[PDB]
From Swiss-Prot:
Family: Belongs to the aldo/keto reductase family.
Primary localization: cytoplasm
Protein name, UniProt field: Aldo-keto reductase family 1 member C3
A molecular-function term among this protein's GO annotations: retinal dehydrogenase activity
Organism: Homo sapiens
Lineage: Eukaryota, Metazoa, Chordata, Craniata, Vertebrata
Length: 319
């Protein structure tokens, strides 16, 4: 397992474990799978306030340190600030609670989960009588400045963003008095949505692209595009799998690794968890890479169309 140096000087394992699982999955599973992930070789763990699993994931991390398997410095742990906590005065308090939940002194990375602000309050998804999500209006530069203060204090080793498009990134990059550039931009990235233009832009600013839904997505009927094709069923990925004697998932992950993208992989299956670390055991040829590049269809699995009205909807621009 290799790492990538952040514009922070910090190192980020290029292979990360995705801890999100739908609410139907017992909260107890997050604890077991994260430990299995660690034992399998994962050193980068991705969590968030939205996942409602920080206590478990954090406990899983501390259990692996306690049993002497790893050192805190060996694990790269990240959490995120939910959209209902974008308001400046709510940022540090959010990070501290996340730290308390995980029982950690610092988070390796803290991200602004999404540029789309939501009504502050208790609800993760505040909605009106019509089931419509209530938006909020916040200057993300102030959210970022609060983010910087958390790094100043040592609560976060690095800080970055997620789901930002070029315009939104430039906004932070061009902010006067900027103290810290985001070390990354975690976005949806897979062969059907390879984000080539955004990727090249991020590299030009020394911002690493971290891919999520890299194995497709979990395809939750509540949140996925019903008409979207199944990535792991792709005939090209499957042909490549056969050629390399690997799996479509391994092919999709390796693709990201070779174009300089940090890849996340969520699995709550012990055998698939262990299979996923095999992404380091082989490599795709330039022609393999070329064929995969051609699969891009600007497809995002998240069925967000109903939020395109949000002024900060990231998918309104080319990239
Ligand atoms: N910031 C954001 O907006 C955002 C959005 C979405 C996700 N994320 C993060 O990124 C992670 C990954 O994204 P995602 O949740 O869409 O998941 P994903 O990694 O695209 O999910 C892959 C799905 O494929 C299956 N899988 C895993 N390894 C496999 C293998 N070797 N062969 C065949 N199937 C395999 C898994 O099912 P099994 O569990 O059955 O193995 C899993 O549900 C999340 O856990 C989360 O931490 C961030
Ligand atoms: C467009 C790019 N994606 C983004 O920014 C991130 C969108 C939020 C993260 C994940 C998408 C959904 C989650 C849905 C959450 C909704 O309740 C709130 C969505 C929302 C609407 C308006 C403003 C902020 C958030 C669900 O838990 C599982 C599924 O994965």
């Amino acid at each position: 397992q290799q790492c990538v140096k952040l514009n922070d000087g910090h190192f980020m394992p290029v292979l990360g474990f995705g801890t999100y699982a739908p609410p139907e999955v017992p909260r107890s599973k997050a604890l077991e799978v994260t430990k299995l992930a660690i034992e399998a070789g994962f050193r980068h763990i991705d969590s968030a306030h939205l996942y409602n699993n920080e206590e478990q994931v954090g406990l899983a991390i501390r259990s692996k340190i306690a049993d002497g398997s790893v050192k805190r410095e060996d694990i790269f742990y990240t959490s995120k600030l939910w959209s209902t906590f974008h308001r400046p005065e709510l940022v540090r308090p959010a990070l501290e609670n996340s730290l308390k939940k995980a029982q950690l002194d610092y988070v390796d990375l803290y991200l602004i989960h999404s540029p789309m602000s939501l009504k502050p309050g208790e609800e993760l998804s505040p909605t009106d009588e019509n089931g419509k999500v209530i938006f909020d209006i916040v200057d993300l530069c102030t959210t970022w400045e609060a983010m910087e203060k958390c790094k100043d204090a040592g609560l976060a080793k690095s800080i970055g963003v997620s789901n930002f498009n070029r315009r939104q990134l430039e906004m932070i990059l061009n902010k006067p008095g900027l103290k810290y550039k985001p070390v990354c931009n975690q976005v949806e990235c897979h062969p059907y949505f390879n984000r080539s233009k955004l990727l090249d832009f991020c590299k030009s600013k020394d911002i690493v692209l971290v891919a999520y839904s890299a194995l497709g997505s979990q395809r939750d009927k509540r949140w996925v595009d019903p008409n979207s094709p199944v990535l792991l069923e792709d005939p090209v990925l499957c042909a490549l799998a056969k050629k390399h004697k690997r799996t479509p998932a391994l092919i999709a992950l390796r693709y990201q690794l070779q174009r300089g993208v940090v890849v996340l992989a969520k699995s709550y299956n012990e055998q698939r968890i262990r299979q996923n670390v095999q992404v380091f055991e082989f490599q795709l040829t330039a022609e393999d890479m070329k064929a995969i590049d051609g699969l891009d269809r600007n497809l995002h699995y998240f069925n967000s169309d109903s939020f395109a009205s949000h002024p900060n909807y990231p998918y309104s621009d080319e990239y």
